[PDB]
Amino acid sequence: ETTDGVYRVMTRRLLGSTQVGVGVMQEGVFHTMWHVTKGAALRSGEGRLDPYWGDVKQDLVSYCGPWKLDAAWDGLSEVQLLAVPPGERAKNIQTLPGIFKTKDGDIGAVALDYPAGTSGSPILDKCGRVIGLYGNGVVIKNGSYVSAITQGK
Amino acid sequence: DMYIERAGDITWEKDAEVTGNSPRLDVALDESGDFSLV
Numbered sequence: 270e271t272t273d274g275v276y277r278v279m280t281r282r283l284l285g286s287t288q289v290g291v292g293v294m295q296e297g298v299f300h301t302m303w304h305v306t307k308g309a310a311l312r313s314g315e316g317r318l319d320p321y322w323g324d325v326k327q328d329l330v331s332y333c334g335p336w337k338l339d340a341a342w343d344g345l346s347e348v349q350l351l352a353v354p355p356g357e358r359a360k361n362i363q364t365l366p367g368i369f370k371t372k373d374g375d376i377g378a379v380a381l382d383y384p385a386g387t388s389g390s391p392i393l394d395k396c397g398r399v400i401g402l403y404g405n406g407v408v409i410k411n412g413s414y415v416s417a418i419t420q421g422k
Numbered sequence: 423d424m425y426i427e428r429a430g431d432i433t434w435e436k437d438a439e440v441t442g443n444s445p446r447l448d449v450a451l452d453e454s455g456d457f458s459l460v
């Protein structure tokens with residue numbers, strides 16, 4: 270299976286089938302986040318997807334080819350997080366992103382808390398392009414989660 | 423060993439639940455890809 274779309278990343282080295290993260294498949298390349306797979310290779314039915322590019326600082330990795338996702342938050346509009354939680358349905362969540370202010374620029378951020386195995390779920394603009402991956406973020410005073418809209422180059 | 427299985431298409435949901443504020447945070451991105459609060 271390499272049909273474009275969103276996929277779950279499962280494993281069996283622990284108790285039963287366990288969703289460790291999410292990813293998107295586009296133009297024959299599978300894009301997820303580095304902490305999901307730690308670069309390890311994946312299987313899809315008969316096949317085997319091997320890593321192609323990765324970067325621990327960006328927390329990104331792509332399989333079977335170069336990173337293909339190049340859409341960005343315009344900033345202004347809201348966006349949807351296509352959350353694929355473990356054991357649960359893919360669900361779309363609309364929100365207006367905030368801002369991670371860094372030394373090298375600003376990044377969009379979504380204030381959406383979901384179980385750990387939701388990491389790598391895509392974030393969409395109103396025209397359907399994937400603008401980033403959910404899962405790398407911070408914990409705030411209130412205790413819940415803020416994730417960056419992490420995109421590749 | 424990790425395997426992948428498909429969970430949906432990628433499309434915008436016009437009937438989506440809307441939620442989540444829009445905070446701005448001063449953060450640092452360390453060498454290991456971990457965001458921290460400043």
Ligand SMILES: N=C(N)N[C@@H]1CCCCNC(=O)[C@H](CCCCN)NC(=O)[C@H](CCCCN)NC(=O)Cc2cccc(c2)CNC(=O)CCCNC1=O
Binds near residue numbers: 382388405413
């Ligand atoms: N925590 C909250 N409300 N929500 C998050 C939402 C995860 C969404 C998917 N994203 C990640 O799984 C990534 C992977 C690692 C990236 C590293 N490149 N994790 C993170 O971004 C942050 C970065 C911390 C930066 C410090 N250096 N880590 C955590 O939140 C783990 C944590 C921390 C304190 C206290 C706790 C859990 C205790 N809560 C819980 O047990 C609730 C169940 C688990 N819910 C969560 O984990």
